[model samples]
Target chain A: MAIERTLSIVKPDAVSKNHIGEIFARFEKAGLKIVATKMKHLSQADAEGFYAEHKERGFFGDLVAFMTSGPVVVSVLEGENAVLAHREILGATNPKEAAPGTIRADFAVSIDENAAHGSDSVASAEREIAYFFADNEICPRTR
Target chain B: MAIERTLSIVKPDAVSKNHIGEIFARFEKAGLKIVATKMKHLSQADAEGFYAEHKERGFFGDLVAFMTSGPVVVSVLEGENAVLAHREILGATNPKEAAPGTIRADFAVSIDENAAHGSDSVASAEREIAYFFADNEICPRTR
Candidate 1:
């Protein structure tokens, strides 16, 4: 099968509590391979933090605060149909709407504090993956 | 089956080299569940970190330097026979001797950069898990 790639983040709220490994486990168990990982501490100085595009969204301001509150793990996953696959495992944007057993449903407390984020589209997946991972930084993996 | 916990580390070299996700994948694939995660930087001054007990080993000094070289992810995994299960997925310490599909065999550069570490016994498992994670820090999960 041809492999595809996407970007995923363990948001700040999840990091502060305990969900990093479990999220990784969730992705892995679903057959997504983690090809790269980077831990980033977003700052108020650069509040955009990959969310600048959503600057006009109603929740944008609160997102900046929540994101800057702690460290987040930005990583890339690879698998067959990885784009849709990651969203399937990630569940809804709000934990309230997420299906049981999904990452957000299992650990998240609210819409803003949801424990996970996956690219909403393939274009953003490509853009975000590049934004967080350098061309040479990601290690190649085989299925 | 009864649940048990064990400690696992993605060594500095592997963390720098991009194996965290793959290693997590290995554990998840083996039915091990990650209950908590912590990323730590070992310093030269506090070089012991957790390996001080191995201070008498001939390679202890070099091991310290390697561990302190970068941030390593200290994590706890839960499973039936977690202690033994983790060791099985970790492969032999010397990558050359490790089996083909094991974490060490796939990512290790040498004995010193073997890419993964697991508690050698149940005693250390309990000690190491507590050393990295607090009693209330871990979130409860169901199978």
Candidate 2:
């Protein structure tokens, strides 16, 4: 990949726990460059729109409620194979199954409170990026 | 006093050295909340405009040149008296004079290569923030 890009988030639980910066530190240490970041509490409509892919899922309502429960840190990280790299850094979806040093394992309280999120695929990355940041919103890479 | 806001920057030197996330982590640990962040290489005009107050100084040209040499990470930190707290965390202008635990003291190679910058005053905070981020660009406070 010619420097891939992926969307990353410090979820509501992490934000509430004040783990945003350390979580970002992990991404940076992994050689992923954070190009853009913003803090926002998702409006119901915003949550619905972003997790539209999960609209049919039974847990969609719970996710929407949780995401709107607090603010989240949204960002874009870029690197070689950033899609996989970002997911690797975030570790598993469930904190119980995540590696010891991974963000979720370190900060998440439970599966329902996983503290970090990364795009699952390259295509999903692009779509997820568009939900929070425009083309101009994502800035340049480190020199 | 109410919660304050200050513009913060990971200067070109620090960004080139890849200390962006660690620097941000310090801010968070100090109780500052980052509301927005972006990475960009300074255009000559952008640098000149941002440092316009220092235009009459002898080092202005050199300062502009150095800032344009590489990309930088820009952000906003909000907290109680954030302008003062930010400066405290950054330490002094010269790493040699900075406090032991300060960001500059830890990461700066020299005065010119200091790792971070923060608004010097609340008045300057608004002005500096406007330079890098528009009203719409800055997100809400962390909840």
Candidate 3:
């Protein structure tokens, strides 16, 4: 299978709580390559635009506000079907319904305070990666 | 809030692969207290009964077999709202719908093959707790 790349974020809560190591371990063990990663806080305007697709939804305003409220860990995850694979590892959004062994089910609380996020598609991955990394900073994979 | 107890099983895949320490770290950061814990493998019969609630479901047979497939790490978590709290951290049964930060969302695959399990209610917690512990073994307190 050809390798692909996706964008991921650990959010402020996971980092502040020190869940980075264990959380990353799951991706590494699953054979996903860590193409790039960075720990930084998002500005309010940047966060709002980043999640603009949800801007018109009920949780839009709060989603942007909370995401920018604290420091967040963002990364580019590389693998086959990277988006879906990462989503599988991330589990459900609510934590309450997440199946056993998933990161969210295992670590987080409610929707507003869930621990991580990922790009939903290859196209979105490109947008997210560019949003979080410099043009020459991320992976230059040969294959 | 009164202190309550709930069951957490890390499953054999996590134990054999040395994810026990990493997994426990998440719970620690979340402020959940591990009141009792041990590593053990379940027999087919034991797994059958442990997941008896799913007996009428399509994946019941496979669930029992897979659980007995390897050694599992079992623990009793204690705290105010322990049962409800853990289930939230674990995320949804589907993992796909689990919120971004929960355990199931982060670790599991599907409803049947989800990576971990927790008590659904106080009654289940008490029964499951008894299934794995001796009368004097469980210690319900926080650090």
TM-score of 3: 0.50
Best of the candidates, lDDT: 2
Two-way lDDT contest, 2 vs 3, winner: 2
After superposition, which runs of candidate 3 have C-alpha atoms over 4 Å from their true positions?
A140-143, B1-143
The per-prediction tally of clashing pairs is 0, 0, 53
> lDDT score, residue B118, model 1?
94
lDDT of 2 by residue, B1-143 (tens): 78988998888888766687788889889899877777777899999999999999999998888788877878888889899989999999999999899999999998777877889999999999998888877767544
DockQ for every model, please. Answer: 0.09, 0.48, 0.03
The digit string of per-residue lDDT tens for model 3 on B103-136 reads: 7776676676566788999999999999878756
Give me the displacement of residue A103 in model 3, in angstroms. 0.6
Best by DockQ: 2
| C-alpha lDDT of residue B65 in model 2 | 86
> Which candidate order results from sorting by DockQ in descending order?
2, 1, 3
Local accuracy of candidate 2 as per-residue lDDT tens digits, A6-86: 999888888876687798889989998777777777889999999998999999999999888877878888889999988
Error of 3 at B92 (Å): 44
Point out where model 1 deviates above 4 Å: B1-115, B118-143
| i-RMS, each model, one decimal | 8.7, 2.8, 14.1
- By summed lDDT, the worst window of 10 consecutive residues in model 3 chain A runs over A134-143
